[PDB]
Amino acid sequence: MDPYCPFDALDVWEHRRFIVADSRNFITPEFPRDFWMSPVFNLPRETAAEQVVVLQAQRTAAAAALENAAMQAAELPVDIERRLRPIERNVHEI
Amino acid sequence: WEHRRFIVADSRNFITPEFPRDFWMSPVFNLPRETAAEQVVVLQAQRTAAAAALENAAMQAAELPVDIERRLRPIERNVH
């Protein structure tokens, strides 16, 4: 698991003034690596398909209530013509 | 002054990972042209649209008990 590197180590001392050819070192933490713990990404069990099932069941349940309300409100036009026509005839009797 | 060791950043420095035999046969790398995750987003938005349409319809239909009173009372007092 060691990355390949031909060269071991080299040395020409670090005078703060004489910095030339500005490269950048690999910045590392001071803590032992063992707690830089492992990669884990876990799925939500509710799947893109499962939410489809749940929301479709909800849509189909709501459609029944919408149809119930429509059929409750679809009888009012029958009520108007069932209630007012006899009243119009009674007025006509005069 | 300061001291440290050094490792030369040569272009020959490569890295060799290991892949599992079933690594590339994942349900995530292999995606169809149409998934259900988008269908969830559409269906939730449609349900939320219907929710507000329900309140609009309720405020529209709240006048049904109101429209009947003022069409009958001025004729009731007319007869009486």
Side-chain angles (χ1 to χ4, degrees):
Chain A
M1 283 73 74
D2 186 73
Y4 185 80
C5 187
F7 300 98
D8 297 332
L10 295 175
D11 287 315
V12 292
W13 268 338
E14 300 179 351
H15 186 63
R16 289 181 182 176
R17 288 192 66 186
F18 291 165
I19 300 174
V20 77
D22 193 6
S23 179
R24 295 177 183 87
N25 300 140
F26 188 76
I27 295 172
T28 45
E30 313 161 349
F31 64 89
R33 55 179 170 174
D34 301 332
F35 294 139
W36 203 70
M37 73 291 291
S38 68
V40 190
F41 184 85
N42 296 301
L43 314 164
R45 188 184 181 93
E46 84 269 22
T47 302
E50 299 292 329
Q51 295 175 353
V52 169
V53 174
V54 175
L55 293 173
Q56 281 182 354
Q58 288 183 355
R59 172 190 277 176
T60 59
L66 284 175
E67 283 298 321
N68 188 5
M71 295 298 102
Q72 182 61 256
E75 192 274 331
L76 189 151
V78 179
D79 276 335
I80 293 178
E81 295 176 351
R82 178 69 174 173
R83 299 294 293 163
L84 288 179
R85 289 182 185 171
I87 303 172
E88 195 268 330
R89 185 66 178 170
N90 189 179
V91 177
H92 176 75
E93 285 291 333
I94 298 168
Chain B
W1 286 351
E2 64 182 1
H3 180 96
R4 72 175 183 266
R5 303 289 289 270
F6 181 87
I7 295 175
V8 179
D10 191 2
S11 67
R12 291 172 178 179
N13 293 323
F14 61 89
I15 197 168
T16 56
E18 295 88 4
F19 286 166
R21 296 178 297 171
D22 297 332
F23 178 74
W24 289 103
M25 294 182 286
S26 297
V28 181
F29 279 101
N30 292 320
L31 290 172
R33 190 180 58 81
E34 291 178 354
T35 64
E38 191 276 344
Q39 296 181 357
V40 174
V41 188
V42 170
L43 165 53
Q44 186 72 41
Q46 293 181 357
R47 185 174 181 266
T48 58
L54 284 175
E55 288 183 352
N56 281 321
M59 295 183 288
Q60 176 64 44
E63 296 181 356
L64 291 178
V66 177
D67 296 331
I68 300 169
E69 295 170 353
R70 68 183 187 270
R71 297 290 179 87
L72 294 176
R73 295 300 300 274
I75 301 174
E76 292 193 345
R77 189 166 61 83
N78 189 179
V79 175
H80 182 76

